[PDB]
Design a protein around this ligand. Sequence first.
Ligand SMILES: CCCCCCCCCCCCC/C=C/[C@@H](O)[C@H](CO)NC(=O)CCCCCCCCCCCCCCC
Ligand SMILES: CCCCCCCCCCCCC/C=C/[C@@H](O)[C@H](CO)NC(=O)CCCCCCCCCCCCCCC
Ligand SMILES: *CCC(=O)Nc1ccc(C(=O)NCc2ccc(Cl)cc2Cl)cc1
Ligand SMILES: *CCC(=O)Nc1ccc(C(=O)NCc2ccc(Cl)cc2Cl)cc1
Ligand SMILES: CCCCCCCCCCCCCCCC
Ligand SMILES: CCCCCCCCCCCC
Ligand SMILES: CCCCCCCCCC
Ligand SMILES: CCCCCCCCCC
Ligand SMILES: CCCCCCCC
Ligand SMILES: CCCCCCCC
Ligand SMILES: [K+]
Ligand SMILES: [K+]
Ligand SMILES: [K+]
Ligand SMILES: [K+]
Ligand SMILES: [K+]
Ligand SMILES: [K+]
Lengths: 268, 282
Amino acid sequence: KWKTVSTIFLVVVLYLIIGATVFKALEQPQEISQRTTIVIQREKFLRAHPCVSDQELDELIQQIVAAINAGSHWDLGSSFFFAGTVITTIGFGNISPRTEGGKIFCIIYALLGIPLFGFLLAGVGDQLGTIFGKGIAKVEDTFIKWNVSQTKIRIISTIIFILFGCVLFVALPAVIFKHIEGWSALDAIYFVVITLTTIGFGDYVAGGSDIEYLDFYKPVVWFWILVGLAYFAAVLSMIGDWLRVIAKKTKEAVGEFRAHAAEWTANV
Amino acid sequence: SDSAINVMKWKTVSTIFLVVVLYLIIGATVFKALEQPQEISQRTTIVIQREKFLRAHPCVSDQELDELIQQIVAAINAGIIPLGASSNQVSHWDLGSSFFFAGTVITTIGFGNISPRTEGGKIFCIIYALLGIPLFGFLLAGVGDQLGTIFGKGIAKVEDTFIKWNVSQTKIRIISTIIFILFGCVLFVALPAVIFKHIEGWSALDAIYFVVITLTTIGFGDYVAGGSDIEYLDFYKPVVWFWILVGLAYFAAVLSMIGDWLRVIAKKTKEAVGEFRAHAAE
Ligand SMILES: CCCCCCCCCCCCC/C=C/[C@@H](O)[C@H](CO)NC(=O)CCCCCCCCCCCCCCC
Ligand SMILES: CCCCCCCCCCCCC/C=C/[C@@H](O)[C@H](CO)NC(=O)CCCCCCCCCCCCCCC
Ligand SMILES: *CCC(=O)Nc1ccc(C(=O)NCc2ccc(Cl)cc2Cl)cc1
Ligand SMILES: *CCC(=O)Nc1ccc(C(=O)NCc2ccc(Cl)cc2Cl)cc1
Ligand SMILES: CCCCCCCCCCCCCCCC
Ligand SMILES: CCCCCCCCCCCC
Ligand SMILES: CCCCCCCCCC
Ligand SMILES: CCCCCCCCCC
Ligand SMILES: CCCCCCCC
Ligand SMILES: CCCCCCCC
Ligand SMILES: [K+]
Ligand SMILES: [K+]
Ligand SMILES: [K+]
Ligand SMILES: [K+]
Ligand SMILES: [K+]
Ligand SMILES: [K+]
């Protein structure tokens, strides 16, 4: 009958405000640092090359920033990657359609492929879940006849799910990404989380740089994208369940606190 | 029982996998066909300009022009207006733009025009995503449920206005799906698209493109509703916030309905091919 939606809306607004403050705190300093150390560069390149005017260099900069949309972008490999970024809704954006017909086809392609890929991803997740059900069935039998509790064997099994999944789907792909892309470890894990959450900023792409790949590589990361999107769907849903549980525990904690203030003053 | 169903399940998922591969191949072919020509045109017409700059400044070290463009492309990923005429700008990380960024994280739209460069920014972004995505999921579920109850009451009366001669119970459902589609596409894509065109200066197709790319959470970032430096009446960005919330709910509904359409067409086509081979010329 009632909402409950208003309080979670307010919680989301609060979460966004806290996040915005923290992000500003962590990111504005390096931004102003790079801004002043590039206004150093604009006039240290110009005085080191007197033949460039102060206004012809700006013609150069204007056309280079005009080249923001191009720099092939559209070999069958890169367009296959793009189609993947569309139907997965990752949408890195490093590749994007510029002609109107490309955008119209992109609209149709998204509206049809997102549900179809949803079916594929659901099936992949179900098959992984049954494989993992048998896998937990055996270690839930070795460790099961010792008196250990039953409603905590499930939390030990979630511990094992999280750990094994994050080593197979986050850890070793991250180390491979660092050894192949040249990314840092933190940058690799960042890429993993941002792509498998379907956020997909595009500041890092697993086949973007020119660095020449082993050709065994893009298909394997395709497979990793498929299986990791499923794993991360599971992880995000279980975090949601964590949230609803802690939500009711906090609801009862506020109930208890106000109930201990209630008749604590009836103590007259 | 426990296993005899799983063979069937792995069969259907394998054929869905092959269908997805085929869809990706077709899409890639069409996209290459539609986008590579203008790309090579612009590339040769940018090297025309590159050596028009080169056939005008030999005193320039002439190979450092490309390291200069390297540093310019490195500087633009952390947005900049790098010209002497105007050394004054507005920052990527005011609380407004950082609020927008946090939204792009928890919605998983991820436009990317703004993204964390600091190590701590990336670690906090990881934590922020892993916690906010489910939370925003709950919010969006509530928004969708309330929208659905408003629309249920709205259709309840038009489910009687139409009770003339010859009327159905389970086939009036198609007029209700038609009304959902049309009214939703008027409120959540159409008029927001025209607003986006008149305020952002985007084309009509660019506005609708932005709408579709944003509410599906693809979020390329090639168009952003608050990106350009312009005025923005502030009566604008909060209403676009609200539009994002309710339109994400609406588009989740639309995508689920398209999925149902696909499931129906899939089973009708398999039974149709069964029927075909069962005939197979007399
Ligand atoms: C990382 C960014 C910072 C996160 C900011 C979260 C601050 C919010 C802390 C709880 C206070 C919410 C206000 C209302 C609380 C209750 O009246 C209400 C039900 O009565 N709770 C909920 O609805 C259920 C809402 C429960 C949502 C809790 C979100 C989980 C945060 C995880 C971070 C914990 C770090 C612990 C060390 C600080
Ligand atoms: C299912 C409902 C989703 C519909 C969401 C999009 C609704 C489109 C309504 C916008 C109409 C605006 C009127 C003016 C349009 C022109 O100024 C504009 C050129 O400037 N044309 C287009 O944008 C051309 C736009 C072309 C629209 C693409 C239509 C593709 C529908 C495919 C649906 C999947 C059906 C699958 C059945 C097997
Ligand atoms: C064409 C220029 C470019 O960026 N090409 C490019 C980038 C990435 C790939 C690729 O296959 N990456 C692995 C992958 C596969 C699917 C998805 Cl949705 C995402 C990724 Cl990162 C290929 C070509
Ligand atoms: C600071 C530079 C910049 O890009 N600023 C910017 C862009 C967009 C907004 C904004 O509020 N857009 C509406 C909106 C709200 C939430 C989301 Cl998740 C996405 C959008 Cl487009 C504000 C500031
Ligand atoms: C624009 C997207 C084109 C992709 C659509 C391909 C059509 C495929 C028709 C069915 C192919 C598999 C049928 C097998 C049924 C037993
Ligand atoms: C499980 C088999 C499904 C095959 C049917 C898919 C049909 C897609 C139609 C796309 C029309 C543009
Ligand atoms: C300018 C309009 C281009 C539209 C291209 C649509 C391609 C349809 C392929 C099925
Ligand atoms: C079922 C075993 C899945 C193994 C996944 C390997 C991922 C490759 C890392 C790039
Ligand atoms: C909770 C995520 C922390 C990631 C730390 C990575 C350090 C290389
Ligand atoms: C319910 C009306 C939403 C209007 C959103 C328009 C903002 C661009
Ligand atoms: K994105
Ligand atoms: K997404
Ligand atoms: K999603
Ligand atoms: K971008
Ligand atoms: K995205
Ligand atoms: K992006």
